[PDB]
Amino acid sequence: GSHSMRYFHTSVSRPGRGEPRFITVGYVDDTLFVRFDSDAASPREEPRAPWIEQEGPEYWDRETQICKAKAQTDREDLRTLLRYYNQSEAGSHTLQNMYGCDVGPDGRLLRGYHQDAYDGKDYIALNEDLSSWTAADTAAQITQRKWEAARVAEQLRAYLEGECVEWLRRYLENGKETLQRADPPKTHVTHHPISDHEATLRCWALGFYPAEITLTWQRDGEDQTQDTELVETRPAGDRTFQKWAAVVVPSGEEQRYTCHVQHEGLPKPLTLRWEP
Amino acid sequence: MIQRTPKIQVYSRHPAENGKSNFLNCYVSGFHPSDIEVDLLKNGERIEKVEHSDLSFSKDWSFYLLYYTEFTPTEKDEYACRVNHVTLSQPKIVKWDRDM
Amino acid sequence: KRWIILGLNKI
């Protein structure tokens, strides 16, 4: 199907406790494959997936050098942002950045991304055209003016249409055992009485990859959107994900309730009911 | 600046079976800023060798982390996760319920 | 593979 590659970066300042901590991770779809942490003993980018281990030592040296350079630029940017927002030097602040590409089944570019956030708020983003910017405020307009002057979007566009797509295709081939395998969810329905009058039906989905999934409860064929408790999809820790959806039903009406499961690994959407 | 309180889920990697080795997970998500404290508890006491994932964030910029440790559940032993964050006036404790 | 920008995109 479709695929994505993303690099996430976070710098967090800590006045009086040294220089900002910098952590970056890279993902293909929902699979972590590289990491870098400036607080590590001897900071290097390290493999986190079997299929990336085969890259040569040149790959790791160049990747490590890019990470270290980003860490230094983030440190200067954090200093800059204090000025843009007329802030004290006493508090801890956050700079986040994501970039990457999406490709379709034919491996052709669907769209690229490059976005920043300051203190958890949208700051500046590359537009879908890969040539213009959207600045969130007057501070970010100064950054936009700088980036426009230095032809930043042009270099980004070249990366996103070129190496991002080409290396994502390479990663998909080298890790095709796992990256191109969808593990369907294992499903079951549980029943927990809460009183004499009502009970909780919980629809479970376990052991699935990728994370994207739809779990819905229906009563007499209508979606129980407003009365469904739906927890965030969560990682099991072995590559797979988990999710459940619960509904409170009047006792004796359990059979009117059906759980519906949509996942990429399933040829047909599943319909489940509780079995006493 | 904005602050977002963490969501907390406590759960096992595989369905829990007494006497069988497993993994206890605590997944914190949707929080900002990123400074957070997470402990896994065994009968009210802190478990020692807890590992965690590297800091990452979702599309809305909010952070998530997974803390985890090997464990063998029994019938008697109670497990929990204890989370402290700037948004919390006191640590929040969420109990492991082997049906959640 | 990561994007090589060499600090040119300072905020």
Whole-angstrom distance between the N-terminal and C-terminal Cα of chain C?
Answer: 23
Which chain C residues have any C-beta within 8 angstroms of a chain A C-beta?
Answer: 1-11
Work out whether strand A121-126 and strand A109-118 pair parallel, antiparallel, or are unpaired. Answer: antiparallel
Count CB neighbours of B4 within 10 A: 17
How far lies A224's CA from each of A21, A57, A206, A228, in Å?
44, 54, 22, 6
Helix, strand or coil for residue A230? Answer: strand
Of C2, C4, C8, the CB nearest to A152: C8
| A6: closest chain C residue by CA | C2
Count CB neighbours of A235 within 10 A: 19
In angstroms, the CA B33 to CA A209 distance is 29
- DSSP structural state of residue A233: P
Chains A and C touch (3+ CB pairs under 8 A): yes
User: In Å, how far is C8's CA from the nearest CA of chain A?
Assistant: 8
Identify whether the C-beta of residue A127 lies closer than 8 Å to the C-beta of residue A113. Answer: no
CA B74 to chain CA centroid, nearest Å: 19
Task: Identify whether A43 is preceded by a cis peptide bond (ω within 30 of 0).
Answer: no
Identify whether the C-beta of residue A36 lies closer than 8 Å to the C-beta of residue A45. Answer: yes
Using CA of residue A164, residue A169, residue A174, residue A178, what is the dihedral sign?
positive
Whole-angstrom distance between the N-terminal and C-terminal Cα of chain A?
Answer: 38
Query: Using H for helix, E for strand and C for coil, what is the string for chain B?
Result: CCCECCEEEEEECCCCCCCCCEEEEEEEEEEECCCCEEEEEECCEECCCCEECCCEECCCCCEEEEEEEEECCCCCCCEEEEEECCCCCCCEEEECCCCC
Identify whether the C-beta of residue B33 lies closer than 8 Å to the C-beta of residue B3. Answer: yes
CA A264 to chain CA centroid, nearest Å: 18
Q: What are the extents of the domains in chain A?
A: 1-181, 182-276
Of A10, A117, A234, the CB nearest to B55: A10
Stated resolution in angstroms: 2.1
Of B2, B15, B35, the CB nearest to A120: B2
Helix, strand or coil for residue A236? Answer: coil
Retrieve residue B3's tokens.
């602050």
Q: Give the CA radius of gyration of chain C.
A: 8
C3 φ, ψ to 5°?
Answer: -80, 130
Chains B and C touch (3+ CB pairs under 8 A): no
Retrieve residue A215's tokens.
């779990």
Using CA of residue B42, residue B48, residue B54, residue B60, what is the dihedral sign?
positive
CA A46 to chain CA centroid, nearest Å: 19
Task: Return the residue in A8, A17, A88 with the most chain B beta carbons within 10 A, the one to mutate for interface testing.
Answer: A8
In angstroms, the CA A188 to CA A122 distance is 40
- DSSP structural state of residue A182: P
User: In Å, how far is C5's CA from the nearest CA of chain A?
Assistant: 8
In angstroms, the CA A75 to CA A85 distance is 16
In angstroms, the CA B11 to CA B7 distance is 13
Helix (H) or strand (E) holding A221: none
As for how many domains chain B has, the answer is 1
| B35: closest chain A residue by CA | A12
How far lies A72's CA from each of A11, A76, A77, A129, in Å?
10, 7, 9, 29
Helix, strand or coil for residue A263? Answer: coil
A77 φ, ψ to 5°?
Answer: -60, -40
Q: Where are the beta strands (DSSP E) in chain A?
A: 3-12, 21-28, 31-37, 46-47, 94-103, 109-118, 121-126, 133-135, 186-193, 198-208, 214-219, 222-223, 229-230, 234-235, 241-250, 257-262, 270-272
User: Given an 8 Å threshold on Cβ–Cβ distance, is A238 in contact with B57?
Assistant: no
Helix (H) or strand (E) holding A70: helix A57-84
User: In Å, how far is C2's CA from the nearest CA of chain A?
Assistant: 7
How far lies A230's CA from each of A52, A202, B80, B100, in Å?
35, 10, 21, 12
In angstroms, the CA A97 to CA B61 distance is 9
User: Given an 8 Å threshold on Cβ–Cβ distance, is A147 in contact with C5?
Assistant: no
In angstroms, the CA A38 to CA A46 distance is 12
Range of the domain at B52: 1-100
In angstroms, the CA B12 to CA C3 distance is 37
Retrieve residue A180's tokens.
């191109």
Find chain A residues with C-beta within 8 A of B13's C-beta. 236-238
Helix (H) or strand (E) holding A146: helix A138-149
Query: What experiment produced this structure?
Result: X-ray
Touching subunits of A (3+ CB pairs, under 8 Å) are B, C
In angstroms, the CA A19 to CA B85 distance is 22
Q: A156 exposed, middle or buried (CB, 10 Å; 0-12, 13-18, 19+)?
A: buried
| C6: closest chain A residue by CA | A69
